[PDB]
Symmetry: D2
Subunit: 116 residues, 4 copies
Protein backbone atom coordinates (compact mmCIF):
# COMPACT_ATOMS: atom_id res chain seq x y z
CA UNK A 1 0.00 0.00 0.00
CA UNK A 2 1.91 3.05 -1.26
CA UNK A 3 -0.49 5.59 0.26
CA UNK A 4 -2.63 5.14 3.38
CA UNK A 5 -4.52 7.76 5.37
CA UNK A 6 -5.49 7.40 9.04
CA UNK A 7 -7.88 9.80 10.76
CA UNK A 8 -8.47 10.11 14.51
CA UNK A 9 -11.13 11.97 16.50
CA UNK A 10 -9.74 14.00 19.43
CA UNK A 11 -13.19 14.78 20.87
CA UNK A 12 -14.52 11.23 21.15
CA UNK A 13 -11.25 9.28 21.49
CA UNK A 14 -12.02 7.09 18.51
CA UNK A 15 -11.00 6.51 14.93
CA UNK A 16 -12.76 9.00 12.68
CA UNK A 17 -15.04 6.62 10.78
CA UNK A 18 -16.68 7.25 7.39
CA UNK A 19 -14.59 10.36 6.72
CA UNK A 20 -14.52 11.18 3.00
CA UNK A 21 -11.37 12.39 1.33
CA UNK A 22 -10.24 13.29 -2.17
CA UNK A 23 -6.71 13.03 -3.53
CA UNK A 24 -5.50 15.28 -6.34
CA UNK A 25 -2.28 15.41 -8.33
CA UNK A 26 -0.83 18.59 -9.85
CA UNK A 27 -0.98 18.47 -13.64
CA UNK A 28 1.54 19.90 -16.10
CA UNK A 29 -0.62 23.04 -16.41
CA UNK A 30 -0.52 23.56 -12.60
CA UNK A 31 -4.14 22.47 -12.17
CA UNK A 32 -5.30 19.87 -9.64
CA UNK A 33 -6.35 16.67 -11.37
CA UNK A 34 -8.58 14.16 -9.53
CA UNK A 35 -6.39 11.20 -8.54
CA UNK A 36 -8.28 9.00 -6.03
CA UNK A 37 -10.91 9.16 -3.31
CA UNK A 38 -12.51 7.09 -0.59
CA UNK A 39 -13.86 6.96 2.96
CA UNK A 40 -12.21 5.80 6.18
CA UNK A 41 -13.17 2.41 7.62
CA UNK A 42 -14.23 1.55 11.18
CA UNK A 43 -10.52 1.70 12.06
CA UNK A 44 -10.25 5.24 10.71
CA UNK A 45 -8.03 4.04 7.87
CA UNK A 46 -8.34 4.38 4.12
CA UNK A 47 -6.33 1.77 2.21
CA UNK A 48 -6.16 1.00 -1.48
CA UNK A 49 -6.21 4.56 -2.83
CA UNK A 50 -3.52 3.82 -5.42
CA UNK A 51 -0.91 1.36 -6.69
CA UNK A 52 2.87 1.46 -7.03
CA UNK A 53 2.51 1.79 -10.81
CA UNK A 54 0.00 4.66 -10.69
CA UNK A 55 1.58 6.61 -7.80
CA UNK A 56 4.30 8.36 -9.81
CA UNK A 57 6.44 11.35 -8.82
CA UNK A 58 4.32 14.44 -8.40
CA UNK A 59 2.74 16.96 -6.09
CA UNK A 60 -0.29 15.45 -4.35
CA UNK A 61 -3.05 16.98 -2.25
CA UNK A 62 -5.17 14.98 0.19
CA UNK A 63 -8.34 16.93 1.06
CA UNK A 64 -10.11 15.39 4.06
CA UNK A 65 -13.80 16.33 4.44
CA UNK A 66 -13.63 17.19 8.13
CA UNK A 67 -16.57 19.60 7.84
CA UNK A 68 -19.15 16.90 7.03
CA UNK A 69 -17.74 14.70 9.80
CA UNK A 70 -18.27 17.34 12.48
CA UNK A 71 -21.62 18.51 11.12
CA UNK A 72 -22.97 14.95 11.33
CA UNK A 73 -22.11 15.03 15.05
CA UNK A 74 -23.94 18.35 15.47
CA UNK A 75 -20.75 20.42 15.67
CA UNK A 76 -20.16 23.48 13.50
CA UNK A 77 -16.41 23.22 12.86
CA UNK A 78 -13.89 25.84 11.81
CA UNK A 79 -12.24 24.28 8.74
CA UNK A 80 -13.77 23.42 5.39
CA UNK A 81 -11.39 20.46 5.19
CA UNK A 82 -7.96 19.39 6.35
CA UNK A 83 -5.50 19.29 3.51
CA UNK A 84 -2.06 17.79 3.10
CA UNK A 85 0.04 18.87 0.09
CA UNK A 86 3.33 17.10 -0.56
CA UNK A 87 5.78 15.95 -3.20
CA UNK A 88 5.85 12.16 -3.46
CA UNK A 89 8.35 9.68 -4.88
CA UNK A 90 10.83 12.23 -6.19
CA UNK A 91 13.76 10.06 -5.00
CA UNK A 92 12.15 6.79 -5.99
CA UNK A 93 9.14 4.89 -4.67
CA UNK A 94 8.21 5.34 -1.02
CA UNK A 95 5.31 4.25 1.15
CA UNK A 96 3.36 7.11 2.74
CA UNK A 97 1.07 7.07 5.76
CA UNK A 98 -0.71 10.38 6.31
CA UNK A 99 -2.30 10.73 9.75
CA UNK A 100 -4.70 13.45 10.84
CA UNK A 101 -5.97 14.14 14.37
CA UNK A 102 -9.19 16.16 14.28
CA UNK A 103 -10.88 18.62 16.63
CA UNK A 104 -13.64 21.10 15.74
CA UNK A 105 -11.28 24.12 15.65
CA UNK A 106 -7.94 22.39 15.14
CA UNK A 107 -6.16 19.61 13.36
CA UNK A 108 -2.73 18.01 13.48
CA UNK A 109 -1.25 16.01 10.65
CA UNK A 110 1.94 14.04 10.19
CA UNK A 111 3.51 11.74 7.62
CA UNK A 112 5.42 8.49 7.99
CA UNK A 113 7.57 7.88 4.90
CA UNK A 114 9.21 4.48 4.50
CA UNK A 115 11.54 3.08 1.86
CA UNK A 116 10.49 -0.45 0.74
CA UNK B 1 -7.15 42.67 14.18
CA UNK B 2 -9.71 40.90 11.97
CA UNK B 3 -7.18 38.27 10.84
CA UNK B 4 -3.82 37.43 12.43
CA UNK B 5 -1.58 34.42 11.80
CA UNK B 6 0.95 33.14 14.34
CA UNK B 7 3.58 30.55 13.41
CA UNK B 8 5.74 28.54 15.82
CA UNK B 9 8.77 26.30 15.26
CA UNK B 10 8.50 22.96 17.13
CA UNK B 11 12.11 21.97 16.32
CA UNK B 12 13.87 25.04 17.70
CA UNK B 13 11.31 26.23 20.27
CA UNK B 14 10.97 29.69 18.77
CA UNK B 15 8.62 31.84 16.74
CA UNK B 16 8.89 31.00 13.05
CA UNK B 17 10.27 34.27 11.65
CA UNK B 18 10.08 35.44 8.03
CA UNK B 19 7.52 32.80 7.05
CA UNK B 20 5.73 33.87 3.87
CA UNK B 21 2.03 33.28 3.29
CA UNK B 22 -0.74 34.22 0.87
CA UNK B 23 -4.45 34.44 1.69
CA UNK B 24 -7.08 33.69 -0.95
CA UNK B 25 -10.86 33.95 -1.02
CA UNK B 26 -13.01 31.53 -3.00
CA UNK B 27 -14.70 33.16 -5.99
CA UNK B 28 -18.14 32.35 -7.39
CA UNK B 29 -16.53 30.04 -9.98
CA UNK B 30 -14.64 28.08 -7.26
CA UNK B 31 -11.29 29.63 -8.20
CA UNK B 32 -9.06 31.14 -5.51
CA UNK B 33 -8.93 34.96 -5.72
CA UNK B 34 -5.93 36.77 -4.17
CA UNK B 35 -6.96 38.43 -0.90
CA UNK B 36 -3.98 39.26 1.36
CA UNK B 37 -0.38 38.26 2.07
CA UNK B 38 2.71 38.93 4.13
CA UNK B 39 5.47 37.36 6.16
CA UNK B 40 5.76 36.74 9.88
CA UNK B 41 7.62 39.20 12.11
CA UNK B 42 10.32 38.42 14.67
CA UNK B 43 7.46 37.39 16.99
CA UNK B 44 6.24 34.83 14.45
CA UNK B 45 3.11 36.92 13.88
CA UNK B 46 1.53 38.45 10.79
CA UNK B 47 -0.87 41.32 11.56
CA UNK B 48 -2.58 43.82 9.30
CA UNK B 49 -3.70 41.33 6.64
CA UNK B 50 -7.15 42.88 6.18
CA UNK B 51 -9.66 45.35 7.61
CA UNK B 52 -13.06 44.69 9.14
CA UNK B 53 -14.88 46.27 6.17
CA UNK B 54 -13.01 44.21 3.56
CA UNK B 55 -13.21 40.89 5.43
CA UNK B 56 -16.73 39.65 4.69
CA UNK B 57 -18.34 36.22 4.42
CA UNK B 58 -16.38 33.81 2.27
CA UNK B 59 -14.24 30.73 2.21
CA UNK B 60 -10.65 31.75 2.87
CA UNK B 61 -7.42 29.83 2.36
CA UNK B 62 -4.20 30.71 4.16
CA UNK B 63 -1.30 29.09 2.30
CA UNK B 64 1.84 29.17 4.46
CA UNK B 65 5.18 28.54 2.69
CA UNK B 66 6.58 26.13 5.25
CA UNK B 67 8.79 24.45 2.64
CA UNK B 68 10.96 27.55 2.16
CA UNK B 69 11.24 27.93 5.94
CA UNK B 70 12.64 24.42 6.43
CA UNK B 71 14.85 24.59 3.34
CA UNK B 72 16.50 27.72 4.76
CA UNK B 73 17.46 25.57 7.78
CA UNK B 74 18.87 22.78 5.60
CA UNK B 75 15.92 20.48 6.33
CA UNK B 76 14.01 18.66 3.60
CA UNK B 77 10.39 18.86 4.78
CA UNK B 78 7.34 16.82 3.88
CA UNK B 79 4.77 19.46 2.95
CA UNK B 80 4.78 21.90 0.07
CA UNK B 81 2.95 24.32 2.35
CA UNK B 82 0.57 24.36 5.29
CA UNK B 83 -2.90 25.43 4.35
CA UNK B 84 -5.85 26.46 6.46
CA UNK B 85 -9.23 26.65 4.69
CA UNK B 86 -12.22 28.04 6.57
CA UNK B 87 -15.46 29.97 6.24
CA UNK B 88 -15.25 33.37 7.91
CA UNK B 89 -17.77 36.07 8.84
CA UNK B 90 -20.85 34.00 7.98
CA UNK B 91 -22.48 35.29 11.19
CA UNK B 92 -21.08 38.79 10.73
CA UNK B 93 -17.62 40.05 11.67
CA UNK B 94 -15.39 38.02 13.94
CA UNK B 95 -11.73 38.31 14.85
CA UNK B 96 -9.65 35.31 13.78
CA UNK B 97 -6.27 34.15 15.01
CA UNK B 98 -4.85 31.22 13.05
CA UNK B 99 -1.93 29.50 14.76
CA UNK B 100 0.36 26.96 13.10
CA UNK B 101 2.97 24.82 14.88
CA UNK B 102 5.55 23.52 12.40
CA UNK B 103 7.73 20.42 12.27
CA UNK B 104 9.50 19.05 9.17
CA UNK B 105 7.01 16.18 8.68
CA UNK B 106 4.04 17.54 10.60
CA UNK B 107 2.03 20.59 11.39
CA UNK B 108 -0.72 21.47 13.83
CA UNK B 109 -3.12 24.36 13.39
CA UNK B 110 -5.84 25.89 15.51
CA UNK B 111 -8.12 28.90 15.36
CA UNK B 112 -9.20 31.34 18.04
CA UNK B 113 -12.42 33.09 16.97
CA UNK B 114 -13.66 36.03 19.04
CA UNK B 115 -16.74 38.21 18.77
CA UNK B 116 -15.98 41.99 18.67
CA UNK C 1 8.11 37.10 32.07
CA UNK C 2 10.40 34.22 33.07
CA UNK C 3 7.57 31.66 32.83
CA UNK C 4 4.19 32.07 31.13
CA UNK C 5 1.61 29.40 30.28
CA UNK C 6 -0.97 29.81 27.51
CA UNK C 7 -3.88 27.40 27.14
CA UNK C 8 -6.18 27.07 24.11
CA UNK C 9 -9.45 25.18 23.59
CA UNK C 10 -9.50 23.18 20.33
CA UNK C 11 -13.21 22.31 20.66
CA UNK C 12 -14.59 25.84 20.99
CA UNK C 13 -11.84 27.84 19.26
CA UNK C 14 -11.17 30.07 22.24
CA UNK C 15 -8.66 30.69 25.00
CA UNK C 16 -9.12 28.19 27.81
CA UNK C 17 -10.18 30.49 30.67
CA UNK C 18 -9.97 29.71 34.40
CA UNK C 19 -7.74 26.67 33.89
CA UNK C 20 -5.93 25.85 37.14
CA UNK C 21 -2.34 24.65 37.25
CA UNK C 22 0.45 23.99 39.74
CA UNK C 23 4.18 24.18 39.02
CA UNK C 24 6.64 21.95 40.89
CA UNK C 25 10.43 21.73 40.98
CA UNK C 26 12.24 18.44 41.46
CA UNK C 27 14.01 18.21 44.81
CA UNK C 28 17.31 16.45 45.54
CA UNK C 29 15.38 13.36 46.72
CA UNK C 30 13.36 13.19 43.44
CA UNK C 31 10.18 14.44 45.12
CA UNK C 32 8.20 17.30 43.57
CA UNK C 33 8.48 20.52 45.61
CA UNK C 34 5.75 23.18 45.24
CA UNK C 35 7.04 26.10 43.17
CA UNK C 36 4.23 28.24 41.68
CA UNK C 37 0.57 28.12 40.68
CA UNK C 38 -2.38 30.04 39.30
CA UNK C 39 -5.23 29.96 36.83
CA UNK C 40 -5.48 31.27 33.29
CA UNK C 41 -7.00 34.69 32.60
CA UNK C 42 -9.69 35.57 30.06
CA UNK C 43 -6.90 35.49 27.45
CA UNK C 44 -6.04 31.90 28.39
CA UNK C 45 -2.71 33.09 29.82
CA UNK C 46 -1.07 32.74 33.22
CA UNK C 47 1.65 35.34 33.88
CA UNK C 48 3.57 36.22 37.02
CA UNK C 49 4.33 32.64 38.09
CA UNK C 50 7.91 33.39 39.15
CA UNK C 51 10.72 35.95 39.04
CA UNK C 52 14.06 35.75 37.29
CA UNK C 53 15.96 35.48 40.60
CA UNK C 54 13.80 32.62 41.92
CA UNK C 55 13.70 30.64 38.66
CA UNK C 56 17.04 28.82 38.60
CA UNK C 57 18.25 25.54 37.12
CA UNK C 58 15.99 22.62 37.88
CA UNK C 59 13.53 20.15 36.49
CA UNK C 60 10.09 21.75 36.51
CA UNK C 61 6.65 20.19 36.11
CA UNK C 62 3.60 22.18 35.06
CA UNK C 63 0.49 20.18 35.98
CA UNK C 64 -2.56 21.65 34.22
CA UNK C 65 -5.99 20.60 35.55
CA UNK C 66 -7.58 19.91 32.18
CA UNK C 67 -10.03 17.43 33.70
CA UNK C 68 -11.87 20.11 35.69
CA UNK C 69 -11.99 22.31 32.59
CA UNK C 70 -13.76 19.66 30.49
CA UNK C 71 -16.02 18.55 33.33
CA UNK C 72 -17.28 22.13 33.67
CA UNK C 73 -18.38 21.84 30.01
CA UNK C 74 -20.15 18.52 30.59
CA UNK C 75 -17.45 16.56 28.75
CA UNK C 76 -15.82 13.44 30.19
CA UNK C 77 -12.17 13.80 29.15
CA UNK C 78 -9.38 11.26 28.86
CA UNK C 79 -6.57 12.82 30.88
CA UNK C 80 -6.40 13.53 34.58
CA UNK C 81 -4.25 16.54 33.72
CA UNK C 82 -1.80 17.75 31.11
CA UNK C 83 1.74 17.84 32.36
CA UNK C 84 4.85 19.44 30.94
CA UNK C 85 8.17 18.37 32.48
CA UNK C 86 11.35 20.17 31.43
CA UNK C 87 14.77 21.33 32.56
CA UNK C 88 14.97 25.12 32.77
CA UNK C 89 17.80 27.63 33.21
CA UNK C 90 20.61 25.08 32.86
CA UNK C 91 22.46 27.59 30.65
CA UNK C 92 21.44 30.54 32.79
CA UNK C 93 18.16 32.47 32.68
CA UNK C 94 15.80 32.07 29.78
CA UNK C 95 12.21 33.16 29.23
CA UNK C 96 9.79 30.26 28.75
CA UNK C 97 6.33 30.23 27.21
CA UNK C 98 4.55 26.89 27.54
CA UNK C 99 1.51 26.55 25.28
CA UNK C 100 -1.08 23.79 25.56
CA UNK C 101 -3.86 23.09 23.04
CA UNK C 102 -6.63 21.03 24.64
CA UNK C 103 -9.15 18.52 23.31
CA UNK C 104 -11.14 16.01 25.39
CA UNK C 105 -8.99 13.01 24.34
CA UNK C 106 -5.84 14.81 23.25
CA UNK C 107 -3.48 17.62 23.99
CA UNK C 108 -0.59 19.28 22.22
CA UNK C 109 2.10 21.29 23.94
CA UNK C 110 5.03 23.37 22.76
CA UNK C 111 7.62 25.65 24.30
CA UNK C 112 9.03 28.95 23.12
CA UNK C 113 12.39 29.60 24.81
CA UNK C 114 14.00 33.02 24.41
CA UNK C 115 17.29 34.44 25.62
CA UNK C 116 16.94 37.74 27.57
CA UNK D 1 -4.03 -5.99 23.83
CA UNK D 2 -5.63 -3.76 26.47
CA UNK D 3 -2.92 -1.08 26.31
CA UNK D 4 -0.77 -0.18 23.31
CA UNK D 5 1.46 2.86 22.80
CA UNK D 6 2.49 4.22 19.39
CA UNK D 7 5.17 6.89 19.00
CA UNK D 8 5.90 8.92 15.86
CA UNK D 9 8.81 11.21 14.95
CA UNK D 10 7.72 14.55 13.43
CA UNK D 11 11.28 15.55 12.46
CA UNK D 12 12.22 12.47 10.45
CA UNK D 13 8.77 11.31 9.28
CA UNK D 14 9.21 7.87 10.79
CA UNK D 15 8.03 5.74 13.67
CA UNK D 16 9.99 6.60 16.79
CA UNK D 17 11.94 3.36 17.22
CA UNK D 18 13.54 2.08 20.44
CA UNK D 19 11.79 4.67 22.61
CA UNK D 20 11.70 3.58 26.25
CA UNK D 21 8.66 4.15 28.39
CA UNK D 22 7.53 3.35 31.91
CA UNK D 23 3.95 2.84 33.08
CA UNK D 24 2.91 3.55 36.66
CA UNK D 25 -0.33 3.04 38.55
CA UNK D 26 -1.46 5.21 41.47
CA UNK D 27 -1.44 3.24 44.71
CA UNK D 28 -3.85 3.56 47.63
CA UNK D 29 -1.38 5.89 49.37
CA UNK D 30 -1.31 8.21 46.30
CA UNK D 31 2.18 7.08 45.29
CA UNK D 32 3.12 5.94 41.78
CA UNK D 33 3.77 2.21 41.70
CA UNK D 34 5.76 0.69 38.80
CA UNK D 35 3.30 -1.15 36.56
CA UNK D 36 5.00 -2.05 33.25
CA UNK D 37 7.71 -0.86 30.88
CA UNK D 38 9.16 -1.50 27.45
CA UNK D 39 10.58 -0.03 24.24
CA UNK D 40 8.91 0.72 20.92
CA UNK D 41 9.53 -1.62 17.98
CA UNK D 42 10.60 -0.74 14.43
CA UNK D 43 6.95 0.22 13.83
CA UNK D 44 7.03 2.65 16.75
CA UNK D 45 4.61 0.47 18.70
CA UNK D 46 4.85 -1.09 22.14
CA UNK D 47 2.52 -4.07 22.58
CA UNK D 48 2.16 -6.52 25.43
CA UNK D 49 2.56 -4.11 28.35
CA UNK D 50 -0.27 -5.71 30.32
CA UNK D 51 -3.17 -8.18 30.31
CA UNK D 52 -6.92 -7.85 30.75
CA UNK D 53 -6.64 -9.44 34.20
CA UNK D 54 -3.83 -7.18 35.43
CA UNK D 55 -5.11 -3.91 33.90
CA UNK D 56 -7.67 -3.07 36.59
CA UNK D 57 -9.44 0.23 37.25
CA UNK D 58 -6.99 2.89 38.32
CA UNK D 59 -5.08 6.02 37.49
CA UNK D 60 -2.18 5.24 35.16
CA UNK D 61 0.79 7.29 33.99
CA UNK D 62 2.75 6.51 30.83
CA UNK D 63 6.12 8.28 30.93
CA UNK D 64 7.81 8.22 27.51
CA UNK D 65 11.58 8.82 27.53
CA UNK D 66 11.62 11.38 24.74
CA UNK D 67 14.79 13.01 26.08
CA UNK D 68 17.04 10.00 25.39
CA UNK D 69 15.48 9.59 21.95
CA UNK D 70 16.36 13.12 20.88
CA UNK D 71 19.78 13.11 22.54
CA UNK D 72 20.74 9.98 20.59
CA UNK D 73 20.00 11.97 17.40
CA UNK D 74 22.20 14.84 18.60
CA UNK D 75 19.25 17.08 19.53
CA UNK D 76 18.94 18.74 22.93
CA UNK D 77 15.17 18.61 23.47
CA UNK D 78 12.92 20.64 25.73
CA UNK D 79 11.02 17.98 27.70
CA UNK D 80 12.35 15.43 30.16
CA UNK D 81 9.66 13.02 28.96
CA UNK D 82 6.17 13.03 27.52
CA UNK D 83 3.63 11.83 30.02
CA UNK D 84 0.04 10.70 29.74
CA UNK D 85 -2.01 10.40 32.95
CA UNK D 86 -5.49 8.91 32.75
CA UNK D 87 -8.13 6.89 34.57
CA UNK D 88 -8.62 3.49 32.94
CA UNK D 89 -11.41 0.92 33.04
CA UNK D 90 -13.64 2.75 35.50
CA UNK D 91 -16.75 1.78 33.49
CA UNK D 92 -15.53 -1.72 32.71
CA UNK D 93 -12.72 -3.04 30.54
CA UNK D 94 -11.63 -0.97 27.56
CA UNK D 95 -8.81 -1.17 25.04
CA UNK D 96 -6.51 1.86 25.00
CA UNK D 97 -4.16 3.06 22.29
CA UNK D 98 -2.01 5.99 23.36
CA UNK D 99 -0.30 7.81 20.49
CA UNK D 100 2.41 10.43 20.80
CA UNK D 101 3.85 12.61 18.02
CA UNK D 102 7.26 13.97 19.00
CA UNK D 103 9.28 17.07 18.09
CA UNK D 104 12.26 18.48 20.00
CA UNK D 105 10.25 21.31 21.62
CA UNK D 106 6.72 19.92 21.31
CA UNK D 107 4.61 16.84 21.56
CA UNK D 108 1.03 15.89 20.77
CA UNK D 109 -0.75 12.94 22.31
CA UNK D 110 -4.14 11.35 21.85
CA UNK D 111 -6.02 8.27 23.00
CA UNK D 112 -8.26 5.85 21.16
CA UNK D 113 -10.55 4.04 23.61
CA UNK D 114 -12.57 1.08 22.35
CA UNK D 115 -15.11 -1.17 24.04
CA UNK D 116 -14.48 -4.88 23.26
O1 LIG E 1 16.47 22.40 19.26
C1 LIG E 1 16.88 22.23 17.98
C2 LIG E 1 16.67 21.01 17.35
C3 LIG E 1 17.10 20.83 16.04
O2 LIG E 1 16.89 19.63 15.43
C4 LIG E 1 17.72 21.87 15.35
C5 LIG E 1 17.93 23.08 15.99
C6 LIG E 1 18.57 24.13 15.32
C7 LIG E 1 18.46 24.11 13.79
C8 LIG E 1 19.06 25.13 13.03
C9 LIG E 1 19.39 24.81 11.72
C10 LIG E 1 19.98 25.73 10.87
C11 LIG E 1 20.25 27.02 11.32
O3 LIG E 1 20.83 27.93 10.50
C12 LIG E 1 19.93 27.37 12.62
C13 LIG E 1 19.34 26.44 13.47
O4 LIG E 1 19.03 26.81 14.74
C14 LIG E 1 17.51 23.26 17.30
O1 LIG F 1 -17.41 24.60 18.42
C1 LIG F 1 -17.88 23.86 19.46
C2 LIG F 1 -17.82 22.48 19.41
C3 LIG F 1 -18.30 21.73 20.48
O2 LIG F 1 -18.24 20.37 20.43
C4 LIG F 1 -18.83 22.36 21.60
C5 LIG F 1 -18.89 23.75 21.65
C6 LIG F 1 -19.42 24.40 22.76
C7 LIG F 1 -19.36 23.62 24.08
C8 LIG F 1 -19.87 24.20 25.26
C9 LIG F 1 -20.27 23.32 26.25
C10 LIG F 1 -20.78 23.77 27.47
C11 LIG F 1 -20.90 25.13 27.71
O3 LIG F 1 -21.39 25.58 28.89
C12 LIG F 1 -20.50 26.04 26.73
C13 LIG F 1 -19.99 25.58 25.52
O4 LIG F 1 -19.60 26.48 24.58
C14 LIG F 1 -18.41 24.50 20.58
O1 LIG G 1 0.80 22.77 20.75
C1 LIG G 1 0.26 23.78 20.02
C2 LIG G 1 -0.35 23.50 18.81
C3 LIG G 1 -0.91 24.53 18.06
O2 LIG G 1 -1.50 24.26 16.87
C4 LIG G 1 -0.85 25.85 18.53
C5 LIG G 1 -0.24 26.14 19.74
C6 LIG G 1 -0.19 27.44 20.24
C7 LIG G 1 -0.94 28.51 19.42
C8 LIG G 1 -1.01 29.85 19.85
C9 LIG G 1 -2.13 30.57 19.43
C10 LIG G 1 -2.33 31.91 19.77
C11 LIG G 1 -1.39 32.55 20.57
O3 LIG G 1 -1.57 33.85 20.91
C12 LIG G 1 -0.27 31.86 21.01
C13 LIG G 1 -0.08 30.52 20.65
O4 LIG G 1 1.02 29.86 21.09
C14 LIG G 1 0.31 25.10 20.49
O1 LIG H 1 -1.16 13.27 18.65
C1 LIG H 1 -1.18 12.82 17.37
C2 LIG H 1 -1.14 13.74 16.33
C3 LIG H 1 -1.16 13.30 15.02
O2 LIG H 1 -1.12 14.23 14.02
C4 LIG H 1 -1.22 11.94 14.73
C5 LIG H 1 -1.26 11.00 15.77
C6 LIG H 1 -1.32 9.63 15.50
C7 LIG H 1 -0.82 9.20 14.10
C8 LIG H 1 -0.80 7.86 13.66
C9 LIG H 1 -0.07 7.62 12.50
C10 LIG H 1 0.05 6.36 11.93
C11 LIG H 1 -0.60 5.29 12.52
O3 LIG H 1 -0.50 4.05 11.98
C12 LIG H 1 -1.34 5.49 13.68
C13 LIG H 1 -1.45 6.76 14.24
O4 LIG H 1 -2.18 6.94 15.36
C14 LIG H 1 -1.24 11.45 17.09
NA1 LIG I 1 14.50 12.74 -8.45
NA1 LIG J 1 -25.08 33.00 8.82
NA1 LIG K 1 24.73 24.17 31.52
NA1 LIG L 1 -17.29 2.50 37.83
Amino acid sequence: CPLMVKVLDAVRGSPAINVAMHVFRKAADDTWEPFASGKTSESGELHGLTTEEEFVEGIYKVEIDTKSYWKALGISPFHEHAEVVFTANDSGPRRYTIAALLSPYSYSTTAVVTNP
